[PDB]
Amino acid sequence: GPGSYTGAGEPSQADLDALLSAVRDNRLSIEQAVTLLTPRRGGGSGGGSMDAKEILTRFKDGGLDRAAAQALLAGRTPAAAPRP
């Protein structure tokens, strides 16, 4: 982890869901939600270079689900129950 203090771990839904409600309600900007994140370089599956700017732009337009927005900002794949 970072510095002499370490223990920073991985980003939580408790950090993301608080920020995403403010941009969903148009209190918070796309550019501000990228600068307050400290963006990851990539992760998950498919095209790995999925940037926070594109994630917030699609989430605010309604082209991305809240679960997918949280997953891609955290640097992982989203999940659902595999029903018949």
Tab-separated table of N, CA and C in Angstrom, residues 35-83:
chain	number	residue	atom	x	y	z
A	35	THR	N	-12.389	13.622	-11.207
A	35	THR	CA	-11.274	14.159	-10.394
A	35	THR	C	-11.324	13.731	-8.917
A	36	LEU	N	-12.525	13.487	-8.372
A	36	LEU	CA	-12.730	12.991	-7.001
A	36	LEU	C	-12.526	11.470	-6.850
A	37	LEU	N	-12.538	10.717	-7.952
A	37	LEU	CA	-12.363	9.260	-7.983
A	37	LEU	C	-10.921	8.807	-7.691
A	38	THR	N	-9.936	9.528	-8.238
A	38	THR	CA	-8.584	9.020	-8.557
A	38	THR	C	-8.670	7.767	-9.456
A	39	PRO	N	-8.839	7.947	-10.788
A	39	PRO	CA	-9.165	6.860	-11.720
A	39	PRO	C	-8.129	5.727	-11.770
A	40	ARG	N	-8.614	4.493	-11.975
A	40	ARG	CA	-7.795	3.319	-12.325
A	40	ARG	C	-7.444	3.317	-13.824
A	41	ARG	N	-6.323	2.688	-14.202
A	41	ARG	CA	-5.905	2.528	-15.614
A	41	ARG	C	-6.828	1.590	-16.404
A	42	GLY	N	-7.431	0.605	-15.736
A	42	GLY	CA	-8.309	-0.401	-16.345
A	42	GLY	C	-8.527	-1.632	-15.466
A	43	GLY	N	-9.221	-2.630	-16.017
A	43	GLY	CA	-9.495	-3.916	-15.368
A	43	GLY	C	-10.686	-4.660	-15.982
A	44	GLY	N	-11.197	-5.665	-15.267
A	44	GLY	CA	-12.353	-6.472	-15.687
A	44	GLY	C	-12.079	-7.333	-16.930
A	45	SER	N	-13.020	-7.317	-17.876
A	45	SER	CA	-12.995	-8.086	-19.134
A	45	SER	C	-13.489	-7.232	-20.324
A	46	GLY	N	-13.283	-7.712	-21.553
A	46	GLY	CA	-13.477	-6.929	-22.783
A	46	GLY	C	-12.388	-5.869	-22.982
A	47	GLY	N	-12.751	-4.696	-23.517
A	47	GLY	CA	-11.837	-3.552	-23.655
A	47	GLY	C	-11.453	-2.958	-22.295
A	48	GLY	N	-10.207	-3.190	-21.860
A	48	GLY	CA	-9.728	-2.843	-20.512
A	48	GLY	C	-9.578	-1.338	-20.250
A	49	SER	N	-9.373	-0.529	-21.294
A	49	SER	CA	-9.202	0.936	-21.242
A	49	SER	C	-10.532	1.707	-21.123
A	50	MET	N	-11.449	1.234	-20.270
A	50	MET	CA	-12.731	1.886	-19.982
A	50	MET	C	-12.514	2.986	-18.927
A	51	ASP	N	-12.387	4.231	-19.384
A	51	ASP	CA	-12.056	5.391	-18.545
A	51	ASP	C	-13.263	5.926	-17.757
A	52	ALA	N	-12.997	6.515	-16.584
A	52	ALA	CA	-14.019	7.089	-15.705
A	52	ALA	C	-14.905	8.142	-16.396
A	53	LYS	N	-14.338	8.947	-17.307
A	53	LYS	CA	-15.082	9.922	-18.125
A	53	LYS	C	-16.186	9.246	-18.938
A	54	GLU	N	-15.853	8.178	-19.660
A	54	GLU	CA	-16.815	7.428	-20.474
A	54	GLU	C	-17.857	6.720	-19.596
A	55	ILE	N	-17.437	6.174	-18.447
A	55	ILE	CA	-18.328	5.505	-17.487
A	55	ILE	C	-19.376	6.479	-16.932
A	56	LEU	N	-18.954	7.652	-16.444
A	56	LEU	CA	-19.873	8.680	-15.947
A	56	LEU	C	-20.768	9.240	-17.058
A	57	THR	N	-20.238	9.460	-18.264
A	57	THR	CA	-21.020	9.967	-19.404
A	57	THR	C	-22.165	9.010	-19.753
A	58	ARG	N	-21.895	7.700	-19.841
A	58	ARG	CA	-22.933	6.686	-20.116
A	58	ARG	C	-23.884	6.467	-18.935
A	59	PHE	N	-23.388	6.484	-17.694
A	59	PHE	CA	-24.219	6.351	-16.492
A	59	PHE	C	-25.219	7.509	-16.374
A	60	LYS	N	-24.778	8.753	-16.600
A	60	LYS	CA	-25.645	9.933	-16.491
A	60	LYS	C	-26.669	10.009	-17.628
A	61	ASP	N	-26.293	9.601	-18.842
A	61	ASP	CA	-27.197	9.488	-19.998
A	61	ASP	C	-28.193	8.305	-19.886
A	62	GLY	N	-27.956	7.352	-18.976
A	62	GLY	CA	-28.778	6.149	-18.787
A	62	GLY	C	-28.428	4.987	-19.729
A	63	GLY	N	-27.311	5.087	-20.454
A	63	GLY	CA	-26.749	4.029	-21.309
A	63	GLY	C	-25.919	2.973	-20.559
A	64	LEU	N	-25.678	3.162	-19.259
A	64	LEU	CA	-24.957	2.244	-18.372
A	64	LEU	C	-25.729	2.044	-17.057
A	65	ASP	N	-25.809	0.804	-16.573
A	65	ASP	CA	-26.431	0.473	-15.280
A	65	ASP	C	-25.566	0.905	-14.085
A	66	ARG	N	-26.188	1.150	-12.926
A	66	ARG	CA	-25.484	1.544	-11.691
A	66	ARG	C	-24.493	0.472	-11.219
A	67	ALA	N	-24.854	-0.803	-11.356
A	67	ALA	CA	-23.985	-1.942	-11.051
A	67	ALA	C	-22.750	-1.989	-11.973
A	68	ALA	N	-22.940	-1.749	-13.276
A	68	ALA	CA	-21.855	-1.688	-14.252
A	68	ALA	C	-20.952	-0.458	-14.032
A	69	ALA	N	-21.532	0.702	-13.704
A	69	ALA	CA	-20.774	1.902	-13.365
A	69	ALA	C	-19.859	1.659	-12.154
A	70	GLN	N	-20.391	1.099	-11.063
A	70	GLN	CA	-19.606	0.768	-9.872
A	70	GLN	C	-18.508	-0.272	-10.166
A	71	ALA	N	-18.817	-1.315	-10.947
A	71	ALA	CA	-17.856	-2.350	-11.323
A	71	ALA	C	-16.671	-1.789	-12.125
A	72	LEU	N	-16.961	-1.025	-13.181
A	72	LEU	CA	-15.965	-0.483	-14.103
A	72	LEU	C	-15.118	0.636	-13.463
A	73	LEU	N	-15.680	1.429	-12.540
A	73	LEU	CA	-14.919	2.402	-11.736
A	73	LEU	C	-13.987	1.726	-10.711
A	74	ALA	N	-14.423	0.603	-10.124
A	74	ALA	CA	-13.612	-0.223	-9.224
A	74	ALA	C	-12.536	-1.066	-9.947
A	75	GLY	N	-12.643	-1.255	-11.271
A	75	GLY	CA	-11.703	-2.027	-12.091
A	75	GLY	C	-12.004	-3.531	-12.171
A	76	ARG	N	-13.282	-3.926	-12.085
A	76	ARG	CA	-13.778	-5.315	-12.173
A	76	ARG	C	-14.973	-5.457	-13.127
A	77	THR	N	-15.418	-6.690	-13.378
A	77	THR	CA	-16.675	-6.993	-14.102
A	77	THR	C	-17.921	-6.908	-13.200
A	78	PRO	N	-19.080	-6.461	-13.723
A	78	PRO	CA	-20.361	-6.566	-13.022
A	78	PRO	C	-20.885	-8.013	-12.987
A	79	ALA	N	-21.846	-8.294	-12.107
A	79	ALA	CA	-22.446	-9.619	-11.913
A	79	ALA	C	-23.974	-9.567	-11.710
A	80	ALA	N	-24.649	-10.665	-12.063
A	80	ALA	CA	-26.091	-10.886	-11.907
A	80	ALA	C	-26.411	-12.378	-11.679
A	81	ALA	N	-27.616	-12.690	-11.182
A	81	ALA	CA	-28.074	-14.071	-10.990
A	81	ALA	C	-28.398	-14.763	-12.343
A	82	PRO	N	-27.752	-15.900	-12.687
A	82	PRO	CA	-27.906	-16.577	-13.983
A	82	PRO	C	-29.177	-17.452	-14.015
A	83	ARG	N	-30.338	-16.791	-14.113
A	83	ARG	CA	-31.679	-17.399	-14.143
A	83	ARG	C	-32.007	-18.020	-15.517
